[PDB]
């Protein structure tokens, strides 16, 4: 894990950090959720033409069986597993993860 876990940072800062125009699309980081306490979040930068650079945020909910998920069909025992999976194939994500955000 490590590289990509940014800790307790705000939605505002993650966007500030992901909207850097030299970041490739699919740059990401995992933070804590400001809105839902106990849940994390995956902030991916995307580039739609017309809207320009933007950031999609996905909430990673945890189950008491000890697994994380964004969707329920796919569950992971580990947030590092989740990152690995979404790096290999987007499978619903706006873009597969390609890059651990700089800092």
């Amino acid at each position: 894990a490590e590289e990509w876990y940014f800790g307790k940072i705000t939605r505002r800062e993650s966007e500030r950090l992901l909207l850097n125009p030299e970041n490739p699309r699919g740059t990401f980081l995992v933070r804590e959720s400001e809105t839902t306490k106990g849940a994390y979040c995956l902030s991916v930068s995307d580039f739609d033409n017309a809207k320009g650079l933007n950031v999609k945020h996905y909430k990673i909910r945890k189950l008491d069986s000890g697994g994380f998920y964004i969707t329920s069909r796919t569950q992971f025992s580990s947030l590092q597993q989740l990152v690995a999976y979404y790096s290999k194939h987007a499978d619903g994500l706006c873009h597969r993860l390609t890059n651990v955000c700089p800092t």
Binding site: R11, C41, H57, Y58, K59, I70, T71, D91, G92, L93
Partner: peptide
């Protein structure tokens, strides 16, 4: 705040 959901 809005969050994306996988469809």
């Amino acid at each position: 705040p809005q969050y994306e959901e996988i469809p």
